[PDB]
Amino acid sequence: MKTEWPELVGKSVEEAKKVILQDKPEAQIIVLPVGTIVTMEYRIDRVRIFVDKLDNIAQVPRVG
């Protein structure tokens, strides 16, 4: 199962959403600022993306 998208570092949200959905059609994509205090249970259909001030992906999106 695809669990990580290193290829999306530096891309916009729109492009990250399009690529994650091709690879993971059930994905629930959640957009958060870098540095967000996160304690969350594991959800296998969720993909969190952490974004910078210009809404570019700052780190490697991962399932969870």
Numbering used by the authors: 1 to 64
Quote the study on this structure.
CI2 is a small single domain protein of 64 residues, which has been extensively used as a model to understand key concepts of protein folding and stability. L49 and I57 are both part of the folding nucleus in CI2 and very important for the stability of the folded state of CI232. Here, we have applied an efficient in-cell assay in E. coli to select variants of the barley chymotrypsin inhibitor 2 with increased stability. We, therefore, determined the crystal structures of all four CI2 variants in the wild-type to L49I/I57V double mutant cycle.
In contrast, introducing L49I, which on its own destabilizes by ΔΔGf = 3.4 ± 0.1 kJ mol−1, together with I57V results in a total stabilization of the L49I/I57V double mutant of ΔΔGf = −3.8 ± 0.1 kJ mol−1. Overall, the structures of L49I, I57V and L49I/I57V are highly similar to the structure of the wild-type with RMSDs for the backbone of 0.16, 0.45 and 0.17 Å. The Ile at position 49 in L49I is oriented similarly to the Leu in wild-type and I57V. The Val at position 57 in I57V and L49I/I57V superimpose, except for the missing δ1 methyl group, with the Ile at position 57 in the wild-type and L49I. Analysis of the pairwise interaction energies at the residue level suggests that much of the stabilizing effect of the I57V mutation originates from an unfavourable interaction between I57 and Q59 that is observed in structures of both the wild-type and L49I. The effect of the L49I mutation, which destabilizes the wild-type, but stabilizes the I57V variant is more subtle and not easily explained from the crystal structures. It appears that some of the destabilization of the L49I mutation is a long-range effect resulting in several less favourable interactions among residues 57-62. These negative effects are relieved in the double mutant.
